[PDB]
UniProtKB/Swiss-Prot annotation:
The gene is PLEC. Belongs to the plakin or cytolinker family. Spectrin repeats lie at residues 196-293. Interlinks intermediate filaments with microtubules and microfilaments and anchors intermediate filaments to desmosomes or hemidesmosomes. Could also bind muscle proteins such as actin to membrane complexes in muscle. May be involved not only in the filaments network, but also in the regulation of their dynamics. Structural component of muscle. Isoform 9 plays a major role in the maintenance of myofiber integrity. The chain holds residues 1117 to 1477 of 4684 of the full protein. The N-terminus interacts with actin, the C-terminus with vimentin, desmin, GFAP, cytokeratins, lamin B; whereas both the N- and the C-terminus can bind integrin beta-4. This is Plectin. Widely expressed with highest levels in muscle, heart, placenta and spinal cord. It is found in: Cytoplasm, Cytoskeleton; Cell junction, Hemidesmosome; Cell projection, Podosome. It is linked to Epidermolysis bullosa simplex 5C, with pyloric atresia: A form of epidermolysis bullosa, a genodermatosis characterized by recurrent blistering, fragility of the skin and mucosal epithelia, and erosions caused by minor mechanical trauma. EBS5C is an autosomal recessive disorder characterized by severe skin blistering at birth and congenital pyloric atresia. Death usually occurs in infancy. Epidermolysis bullosa simplex 5B, with muscular dystrophy: A form of epidermolysis bullosa, a genodermatosis characterized by recurrent blistering, fragility of the skin and mucosal epithelia, and erosions caused by minor mechanical trauma. EBS5B is an autosomal recessive disorder characterized by progressive muscular dystrophy associated with generalized skin blistering. Homodimer or homotetramer. Interacts (via actin-binding domain) with SYNE3. Interacts (via calponin-homology (CH) 1 domain) with VIM (via rod region). Interacts (via N-terminus) with DST isoform 2 (via N-terminus). Interacts with FER. Interacts with TOR1A. Interacts with ANK3. Identified in complexes that contain VIM, EZR, AHNAK, BFSP1, BFSP2, ANK2, PLEC, PRX and spectrin. Interacts with COL17A1. Phosphorylated by CDK1; regulates dissociation from intermediate filaments during mitosis. It comes from Homo sapiens (Human).
Amino acid sequence: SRCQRCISELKDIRLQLEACETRTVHRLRLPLDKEPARECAQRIAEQQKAQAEVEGLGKGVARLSAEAEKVLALSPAAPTLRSELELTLGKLEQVRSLSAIYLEKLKTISLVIRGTQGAEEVLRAHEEQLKEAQAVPATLPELEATKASLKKLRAQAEAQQPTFDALRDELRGAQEVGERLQQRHGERDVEVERWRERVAQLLERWQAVLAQTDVRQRELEQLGRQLRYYRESADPLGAWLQDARRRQEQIQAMDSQAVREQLRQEQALLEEIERHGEKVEECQRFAKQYINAIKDYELQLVTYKAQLEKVQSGSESVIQEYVDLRTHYSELTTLTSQYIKFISET
């Protein structure tokens, strides 16, 4: 009576446990879809409720085990009762193990989901500042401002190292749990691969930010030096041409005694102009180097912005300056040269 009743109750609760088992296996076989954060949270809650359901069944098994042992101590039915008891105890421990490890898997994945989504927003911020700074520095004070913005960026990125180090640890944790689940319950990890690729890709993007900041900072240190070298040569030359052009225009526009002085001042000035032929080629040389640097920095930025996916041309302004200087000097040489000839025949 109590033996037969206990066997029936043992079979029923084992079936209930097996149904909990099959539901858990079908759940853990299901990869996350297009809302990973929300779905994983929902499944953790469901698995917490499933784990409590199994534990409730565990209280039924403990009751049935005590009653069985009372009957067995008193019976041709006893081998069946003992066997059925051992089957139910064995199934309970298996479903308990699976429920706990799967809940563990969901929780560790949840940290990875959160971590990668946080790193994306950090990556988005740094990649946009790099994208944003399109204009090249025109002057020494504008240069120092650009360096400051990159220095800040560099500082912010270095401080995010713990965030990405934690992500690597969080992914590693998830791999270990999945492996134990694979080894103890024979179910492959259907989820972890999605996030290894996600984590691996974010790491590369972060390195490009760090690398591109170091390259870009270094671009401006070389570019800045080239600006200093050119401006130190173009400013004194440009001032000199303005000074000499007004002297020549004054000497040119201004008896036999006077003619000798007019030829004398013009003939002497033409000598002065020739002496500056070296200082012009020097200025042309430095300007070409600075233009090349402005071109190098510009292409650096357009490249990076394209990989992730003008207003005017920076070096074009520098082009115009050399045009004005070479034009004025060739014009100045000619005008003085022709005026010496006009005095010479006179």
